[PDB]
């Protein structure tokens, strides 16, 4: 970046010169160039200034063709400023200007960018358009096919990325395939490919492999000197450490990402989400301290039951131990420490079975089944979930059956049974409505609408939202 000092002076020189000679086309070409340097420096408002004046020179004196790249860059900067409506305006004008000329390549670019803006809106109808434009972009990169290599690999990248936000396996396939294409022929595409690969891996719970991939995304961003890049690589390495109970490393990676974000003038929102993450981990640390204090309390109650066995203080200390275990599963489930959750759930089931309680035993069955699903141990999860369902049947519990059915459907979905998943959601709604419990109906409706929204059924989903 030792060359970005004079490389601006020469471009500002050429802009003032095309202004002094009335070379309108080169006024606008150099306005674009300088706006692009400003964009690559994180100066998005100041990029918008001489992207607006490039747009204006093109509209005033230049043919319509000039409007086509300028609308892209303009629509890009609005995206990085979190101005989505504003982006979409020029993004769509870009698509129009590319269709009326039918050059296909620019039509690919406009579709990739449309899919980007919609994907980014949805995390904050949107998923439908996102999938539509990402798929169209992939098809327009296949049609374009050492010619459109970048666009092809990038379209693979974006389509794989769209998959996981719950099709982890096809995302795995697409991203690994794109990386294979890269090796078949230190690139900025490998950055995002490694990035989303580590993200899907850490969703599949394989930490070390996700660690490796996130780690090289960081390294490659350090080499390219892509500051925002390694800010996102550090924020995801911090996510890795946070999900695996390593909080001090998490705050280290989050502070590093903060320093990267705060060195750019117009990356304010990323720095605010980094601050938000840092305080979330700070709060989880207190939650963990509560965990460990109640664990010590549990050790004391265990020594009290060992001494008061058969005394009828055995049952009292047993229910005290059940209460401690319930507090413990609650704290263990706020933070995402699902292994401790499984521990506490299992020990709750052992002391419910000893206490000859059907209700507590059904609850411990539900919590052990949730603990097993959140590990992505789906078969063991459905076995414990049906255990809890059939135990809730034997007693006068309709809530429990509804809960067990809904969560069982969640497991079914995440295993690839979209059909049985929604069927279980709807059965859960059946029991839910049949027992006049409002919140379980709400949750069942929420996953029903989810199942339908991910299946592109607008009418049904919009009806459930009501």
């Amino acid at each position: 970046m030792g060359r970005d000092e004079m490389q601006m002076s020469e471009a500002k020189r050429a802009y003032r010169s095309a202004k002094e000679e009335g070379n309108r086309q080169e006024e606008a070409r150099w306005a674009n160039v300088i706006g692009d340097i400003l964009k690559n420096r994180g100066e998005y408002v100041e990029a918008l200034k001489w992207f607006r004046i490039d747009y204006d020179v093109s509209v005033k004196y230049l043919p319509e063709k000039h409007l086509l790249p300028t609308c892209q860059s303009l629509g890009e900067v609005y995206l990085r400023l979190e101005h989505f409506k504003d982006a979409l305006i020029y993004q769509k004008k870009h698509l129009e200007l590319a269709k009326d000329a039918s050059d296909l390549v620019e039509q690919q670019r406009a579709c990739t960018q449309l899919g980007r803006t919609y994907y980014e809106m949805f995390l904050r109808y949107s998923i439908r358009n996102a999938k539509k434009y990402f798929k169209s972009a992939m098809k327009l990169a296949q049609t374009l096919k050492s010619s459109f290599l970048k666009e092809y690999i990038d379209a693979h990248n974006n389509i794989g990325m769209l998959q996981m936000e719950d099709n982890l396996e096809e995302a795995k396939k697409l991203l690994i395939r794109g990386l294979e294409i890269c090796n078949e022929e230190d690139d900025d595409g490998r950055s995002r490919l490694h990035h989303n690969l580590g993200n899907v891996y850490m969703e599949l719970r394989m930490w070390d492999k996700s660690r490796e991939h996130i780690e090289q995304d960081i390294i490659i961003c350090k080499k390219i000197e892509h500051r925002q890049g390694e800010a996102k690589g550090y924020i995801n390495l911090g996510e890795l450490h946070y999900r695996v109970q390593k909080y001090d490393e998490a705050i280290l990676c989050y502070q590093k990402a903060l320093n990267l974000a705060q060195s750019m003038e117009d990356e304010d929102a990323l720095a605010s989400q980094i601050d938000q993450n840092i305080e979330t981990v700070k709060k989880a640390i207190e939650v963990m301290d509560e965990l460990k204090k109640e664990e010590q309390n549990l050790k004391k109650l265990t020594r009290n039951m060992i001494i008061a066995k058969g005394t009828s203080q055995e049952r009292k200390s047993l229910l005290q131990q059940n209460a401690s275990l319930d507090c413990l599963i609650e704290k263990s489930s706020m933070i995402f420490a699902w292994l401790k959750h499984c521990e506490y759930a299992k020990r709750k089931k052992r002391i419910a079975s000893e206490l000859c309680d059907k209700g507590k035993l059904s609850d411990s069955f539900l919590v052990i089944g949730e603990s097993y699903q959140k590990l992505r141990k789906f078969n063991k999860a459905i076995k414990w979930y049906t255990k809890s369902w059939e135990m809730y049947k034997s007693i006068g519990n309709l809530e429990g059956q509804a809960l067990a059915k809904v969560n069982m459907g969640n497991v079914l979905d995440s295993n690839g049974d979209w059909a049985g998943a929604l069927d279980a959601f709807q059965e859960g709604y059946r029991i839910a409505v049949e027992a006049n419990l409002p919140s379980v109906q709400l949750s069942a409706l929420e996953n029903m609408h989810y199942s339908h929204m991910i299946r592109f059924d607008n009418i049904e989903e919009a009806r459930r939202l009501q």
Partner: peptide
Amino acid sequence: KQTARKQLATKAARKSAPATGGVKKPHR
């Protein structure tokens, strides 16, 4: 999705791919 019955969840980050060209190339 939704688990039926205050969790502490951090925000992750994703990386989309830009379009490959919005820049203009002047003459000199």
